[model samples]
Target: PLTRPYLGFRVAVGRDSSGCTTLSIQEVTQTYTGSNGGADLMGPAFAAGLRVGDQLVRFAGYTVTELAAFNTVVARHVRPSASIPVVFSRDGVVMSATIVVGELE
Candidate 1:
């Protein structure tokens, strides 16, 4: 069997505690390097200068309406370690940035 890491930045189904289009990403945590996930000191979240309260708007261009569908978008549309375009609502402010897609395994 193949063992690997996992998807999401410890995300959830709802936008924190609200029913919104984007799912909940709680907090991006911190920038920890050379431990779990992989090398590259920065993970996908904080690496792109994303911290605080933020929700997934559109990942790598393929817009997903719900978190359920986000899996498909992640596994199929994007690749590991690829710095792709991302969109999120930071404190109710919609903005976009390019972030490296962190590897699971």
Candidate 2:
């Protein structure tokens, strides 16, 4: 079985018209079954108010940049169920959240 810490979300590297790089939130994939059979659950990232279009600024201690580096940081540093401090930009305002990383398996 594939195993890793799960953030319960998807991300991508983005850019603005001026060529500024952005660590953008692409989507928050449902990671759990909801109480309602037809719905799915969102983990701490969503619970902390992260959503699609949110740009990541920091994960753990690494500065957010390329999606590849972000993946490296997550896999190498994050422990499942561990509380992770997250920094993001929403509407150009910096915001912070504490996310409990989830198990991928």
Candidate 3:
């Protein structure tokens, strides 16, 4: 199983309609390059350059569906001592990335 084309991001999980799961993810979708996770993996396009939108941006647990299974689950979740603190936001500008995750083949 090998694929690199599934970009359609729009995962707004701010349940307020009565779902009971404060999982927030306002919205981050734009800038399409080749299509694989919507908006080149969402890196910022609008939303007022965020300033604090990092809600423990997960993936530190690892899970993949493609892109070489997210580079083999980010190379088994980066190593060389350890590194994985991904927080995200665009137009809001809140940054944090101690990524060492790899595996691109």
Quote each prediction's TM-score.
Answer: 0.50, 0.55, 0.21
lDDT of 2 by residue, 30-82 (tens): 23322212224556446556567767657543236665555545554344445
lDDT of 2 at 70: 56
Residue 57, candidate 2: Cα error in Å is 2.8
lDDT of 1 at 1: 15
- Local error of candidate 1 at 35, Å? 19
Give the per-residue lDDT of model 1 (tens digit) for 1-105: 111333445555443223344564565433332322444445565667767566775754323365455544454434445567767764445567777756544
lDDT of each residue in 1-105, candidate 3, tens digit only: 222434333333343333332233334322223322222433332322322343323333221133333333333442322345554433333445554322221
How far does residue 102 in candidate 1 sit from its true spot (Å)?
A: 4.6
lDDT of each: 0.51, 0.52, 0.34
lDDT of 1 at 44: 63
Model 3 accuracy (lDDT, Cα)? 0.34
lDDT of 3 at 9: 38
Query: What is the overall TM-score of model 3 with all chains considered together?
Result: 0.21
